[PDB]
mmCIF file with all atom_site columns, C-alpha atoms in Angstrom:
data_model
loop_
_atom_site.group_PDB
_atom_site.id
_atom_site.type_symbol
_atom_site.label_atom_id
_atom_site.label_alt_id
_atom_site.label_comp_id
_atom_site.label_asym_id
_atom_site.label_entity_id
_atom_site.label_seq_id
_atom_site.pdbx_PDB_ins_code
_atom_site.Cartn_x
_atom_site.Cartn_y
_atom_site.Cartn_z
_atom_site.occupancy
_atom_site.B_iso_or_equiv
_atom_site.pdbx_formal_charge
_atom_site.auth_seq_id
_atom_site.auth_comp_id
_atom_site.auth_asym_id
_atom_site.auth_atom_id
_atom_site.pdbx_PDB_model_num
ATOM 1  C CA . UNK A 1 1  ? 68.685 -37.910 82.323  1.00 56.09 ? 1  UNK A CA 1
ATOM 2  C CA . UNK A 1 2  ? 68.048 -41.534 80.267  1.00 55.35 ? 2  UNK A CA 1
ATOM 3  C CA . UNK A 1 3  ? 71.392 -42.758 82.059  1.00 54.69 ? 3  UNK A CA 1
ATOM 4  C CA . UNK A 1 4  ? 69.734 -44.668 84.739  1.00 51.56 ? 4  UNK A CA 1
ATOM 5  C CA . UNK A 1 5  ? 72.230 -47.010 83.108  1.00 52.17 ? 5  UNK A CA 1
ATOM 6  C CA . UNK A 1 6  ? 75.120 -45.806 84.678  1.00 51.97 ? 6  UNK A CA 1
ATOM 7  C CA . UNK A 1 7  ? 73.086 -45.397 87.738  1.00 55.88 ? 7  UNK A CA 1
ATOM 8  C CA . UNK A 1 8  ? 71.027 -48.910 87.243  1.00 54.41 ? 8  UNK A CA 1
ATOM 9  C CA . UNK A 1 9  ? 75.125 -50.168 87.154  1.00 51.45 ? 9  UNK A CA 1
ATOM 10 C CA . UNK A 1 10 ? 76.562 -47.639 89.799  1.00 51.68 ? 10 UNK A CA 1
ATOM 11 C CA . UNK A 1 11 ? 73.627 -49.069 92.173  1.00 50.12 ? 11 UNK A CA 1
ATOM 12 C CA . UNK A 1 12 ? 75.743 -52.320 91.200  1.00 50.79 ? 12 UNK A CA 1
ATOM 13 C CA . UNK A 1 13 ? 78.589 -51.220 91.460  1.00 50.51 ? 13 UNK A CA 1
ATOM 14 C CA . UNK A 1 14 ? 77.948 -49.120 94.619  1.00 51.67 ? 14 UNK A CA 1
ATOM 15 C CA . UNK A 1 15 ? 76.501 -51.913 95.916  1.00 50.95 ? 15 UNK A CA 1
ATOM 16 C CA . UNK A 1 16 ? 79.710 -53.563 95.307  1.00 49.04 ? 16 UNK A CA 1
ATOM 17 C CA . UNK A 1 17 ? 81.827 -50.508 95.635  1.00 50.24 ? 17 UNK A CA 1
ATOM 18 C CA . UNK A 1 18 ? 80.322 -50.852 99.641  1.00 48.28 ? 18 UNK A CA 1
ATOM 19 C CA . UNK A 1 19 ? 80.874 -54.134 99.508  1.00 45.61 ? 19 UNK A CA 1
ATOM 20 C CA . UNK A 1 20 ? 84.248 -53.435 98.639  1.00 44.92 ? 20 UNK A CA 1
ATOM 21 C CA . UNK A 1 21 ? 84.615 -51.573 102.082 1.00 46.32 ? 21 UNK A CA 1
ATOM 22 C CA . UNK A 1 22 ? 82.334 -53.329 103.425 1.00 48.14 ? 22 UNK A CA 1
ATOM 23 C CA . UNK A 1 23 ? 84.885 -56.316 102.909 1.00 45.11 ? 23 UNK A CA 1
ATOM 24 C CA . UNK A 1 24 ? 86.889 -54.916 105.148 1.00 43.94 ? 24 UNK A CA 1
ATOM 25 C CA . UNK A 1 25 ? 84.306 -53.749 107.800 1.00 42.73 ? 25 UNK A CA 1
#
């Protein structure tokens, strides 16, 4: 699947998404 957009983002995001909790760790 050609979407390694919404993964090349939802590393990004995941990234941020851990972050996110990560925030709090």
């Amino acid at each position: 699947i050609w979407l390694t957009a919404l993964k090349f983002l939802g590393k990004n995001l995941g990234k941020h998404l851990a972050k996110q909790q990560l925030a709090k760790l």
